[PDB]
């Protein structure tokens with residue numbers, strides 16, 4: 175049986191509104207309803223991995239697992255295996271996989287983050303799962319962020335707290351947060367960003383939705399506008415939204431949006447919004463293609479509709495050579511030429527780099543760079559041709575060209591990372607100097623840039 179070079183991944187997010195689900199939820203897993211939907215001819219074809227995020231979930235883990243497994247068995251006639259389940263309050267993530275993948279999946283991690291302080295601590299936060307699928311690391315985050323149209327800044331803060339503090343993936347990647355630890359990272363949930371239009375415009379918004387005219391509404395979606403202004407989810411992608419707002423519905427129908435202020439809402443309006451979202455971030459030049467992104471129309475127990483998204487995701491095999499693992503492959507090397515970091519910091523410490531990659535036996539520390547002043551105020555840290563030659567464990571180009579180098583620039587004085595980024599080894603040529611570039615972030619915000627040239631030697 176050959177190892178796959180592609181898998182498909184289902185992501186679901188549903189705020190269940192503290193109500194049990196209806197007896198049939200198969201449309202969710204089939205990607206059927208509104209938006210970018212899945213072809214009927216694929217209904218019996220199982221996804222490799224199903225990742226289900228719920229919010230306001232009233233069920234026990236056992237109760238929900240039985241519903242999910244019985245749902246997938248009905249669709250596909252396959253009995254899925256439970257990879258992981260993790261719950262914080264009423265926020266839950268379930269990962270299921272086809273039984274043939276059980277020996278391909280390892281290094282399973284779970285964690286949660288509670289957001290807020292005192293008043294704001296007790297129900298919002300995130301759960302997450304990570305694991306390796308053969309040579310590929312996969313991370314999944316289900317977050318329920320702060321509610322209310324006038325709290326977008328709080329949601330942005332909740333995002334930064336979650337990506338700083340959620341402890342998933344390889345703990346050896348100490349300078350790196352979850353936004354750099356995985357080949358593919360999926361972040362989904364009731365992110366709670368709203369359509370920012372005047373309250374008086376509620377009925378106009380409803381009209382637009384009935385006409386399936388979403389453009390003037392999406393142009394006021396807080397998640398899209400905050401992303402465009404680089405306030406949140408920097409370097410994440412989202413598929414185009416072509417489904418109606420998924421919040422806030424009257425229960426037991428989808429004919430009516432319930433937007434008016436009520437004691438039960440704390441006297442807040444809930445204008446129709448795309449609260450329920452799926453975003454992703456994959457390492458550079460890895461295959462990832464969204465093949466569905468939509469909402470169900472027939473699951474009406476909650477004031478939200480379920481959202482689905484599916485993806486093709488490139489994966490690599492667990493490579494063994496006669497040499498690595500457990501030695502280098504002298505036929506392989508990675509050289510950096512003419513490299514410099516441009517940093518937004520006002521500090522005047524010396525900086526060094528760390529290179530981290532699962533193609534190395536361990537991470538590599540550089541010498542200190544040479545600081546200069548950029549023309550527009552900036553710190554430029556020059557490394558020249560001083561950077562250590564990296565010795566990969568395997569030189570075979572079918573392995574090495576699929577790898578990535580994580581880079582951290584660290585203060586000599588504090589050993590704290592000032593910026594993190596990632597370079598693909600999927601080059602146009604080997605034994606050839608080629609430009610490389612990554613933005614650098616810290617706590618998920620832009621802190622600078624790293625650029626230069628690479629020269630990659632493989633056994634071919």
Ligand SMILES: c1ccc(CN2CCC(n3cccc3)CC2)cc1
Pocket residue numbers: 398401402409410
């Ligand atoms: C570096 C440079 C360009 C991209 C592609 N886009 C990502 C999404 C942006 N966007 C966010 C909200 C509205 C647009 C546009 C550019 C990614 C990374």
